[PDB]
Amino acid sequence: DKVNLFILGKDGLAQELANEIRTQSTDDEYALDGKIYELDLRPVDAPHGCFCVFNSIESLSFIGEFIGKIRTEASQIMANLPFTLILANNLPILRHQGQQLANKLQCPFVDVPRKFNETQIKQALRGVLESVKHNL
């Protein structure tokens, strides 16, 4: 019932999302789908899962590039690590490359258009949590 949610982002992007989400913490806990989760949101830079947020070509690449490091690194010791890709608001190229990245990882890809859309945060959140639930 405690989930360690890491959040990757470039240029404070992971921090803004962590902040956005924390403002909704009732009693330092979270209500989703009629349940109450204690989430520990840990934004990062260079039960658990990983939010990956990007808003441009550069941020998308950092995420790719960073997942690659973890990949190569992971080899010398991952398949079930609950990723979820979040695109935060030509837009079409972002979605297409993000969706191929999502496809490669077999992870949900969510678009989040009040800087972030609450309904979309929730979908993203249920993404990671249903994946976490699946791994058990």
Author numbering: 594 to 639, 655 to 685, 691 to 702, 710 to 733, 739 to 761
From the paper:
The p190RhoGAP proteins, p190RhoGAP-A (ARHGAP35) and p190RhoGAP-B (ARHGAP5), are key regulators of Rho GTP hydrolysis and are highly important for maintenance of proper Rho signaling. They share over 50% sequence identity and a domain organization containing a GTP-binding GTPase domain, four FF domains and a C-terminal GAP domain. We identify two GTPase-like folds in the middle domain of both p190RhoGAP-A and -B which we term pG1 and pG2, and show that they are important for GAP activity toward RhoA. Thus, we classify p190RhoGAP pG1 and pG2 as psuedoGTPases.
We obtained crystals of the p190RhoGAP-A and p190RhoGAP-B pG1 domains that diffract to 1.9 and 2.6 Å resolution, respectively. The root mean square deviation (r.m.s.d.) between the two pG1 structures is 1.8 Å over 128 Cαs, and 2.7 Å (135 Cαs) between the prototypical small GTPase H-Ras and p190RhoGAP-A pG1. Crystal structures of pG1 reveal similarities to the Ras-like GTPase superfamily. All five G motifs are degraded in p190RhoGAP pG1. In p190RhoGAP, helix α1 (which follows the P-loop) is extended and sterically occludes the phosphate-binding cavity. Switch I (G2) is completely absent in p190RhoGAP pG1 due to an 11-residue deletion. Switch II (G2) is also degraded in p190RhoGAP pG1, and places a glutamate side chain (Glu636) where the γ-phosphate of GTP binds to canonical small GTPases. The G4 and G5 motifs are disordered in our structures, but their sequence divergence suggests degraded ability to bind guanine base, and in our structures the guanosine-binding site appears to be sterically hindered by the side chains of Glu606 and Arg739, which form a predicted salt bridge with one another. Taken together, these studies establish that the isolated pG1 domain of p190RhoGAP is not a nucleotide-binding domain.
